[PDB]
Amino acid sequence: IVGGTESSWGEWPWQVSLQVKLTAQRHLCGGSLIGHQWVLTAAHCFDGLPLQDVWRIYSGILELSDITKDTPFSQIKEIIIHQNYKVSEGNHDIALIKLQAPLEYTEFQKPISLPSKGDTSTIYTNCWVTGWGFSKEKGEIQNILQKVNIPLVTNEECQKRYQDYKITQRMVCAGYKEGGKDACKGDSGGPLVCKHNGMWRLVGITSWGEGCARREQPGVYTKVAEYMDWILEKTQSS
Secondary structure, three states: OEOOEEOOOOOOOOEEEEEEEOOOEEEEEEEEEEEOOEEEEOHHHHOOOOOOOOEEEEOOOOEHHHOOOOOOOEOEEEEEEOOOOOOOOOOOOOEEEEEOOOOOOOOOOOOOOOOOOOOOOOOOOEEEEEEOOOOOOOOOOOOEOEEEEEEEEOHHHHHOOOOOOOOOOOEEEEOOOOOOOEOOOOOOOOEEEEEEOOEEEEEEEEEEOOOOOOOOOOEEEEEHHHHHHHHHHHHOOO
């Protein structure tokens, strides 16, 4: 997160960190807890190897350096990448992770509510984007969970700043005319949430942008309302 500040315990109880245990354990992507056994993230976080056991999912955490061998984590039981996602294109950048064990909901670890398929984002002005990603372009993973407040822009406005056809109706963008505040590498898969009438909704999944926090260059997110049929079909009881 570029131009953000430090979050507090319980502020973003749905935020998780997707880490891979290599020689050192490394945060690679964010995600959002959407139910006891389900995390929603970006499909491109899995562009490497398909191995599930390398991943550790941490929830109810604020600071990456606080994690030690005794810190609890979740494991992956299943990864479900959208059938239309291709590594070579930006579209359909969404994936579900089913955890091996259901997590209980506590003040520190709780789901973000999902929207409805047709309901509107026009009731929102500014939304919040969070993560441990870079704090500048070519920066480094941040230790303490960062938050930044950014206005949504229309898709017509967003498409002015990107190559034709790259911004679809299933994406939403957010940015400031003169930049300085945006998601960046390492925030991918995390939440863009908006609050209205005291209720938070998951509106976007951090996906991509041209650099980070440049002027006239809104960040691009997968629009969650446009995938609600897919999300409900894939997560339904067996």
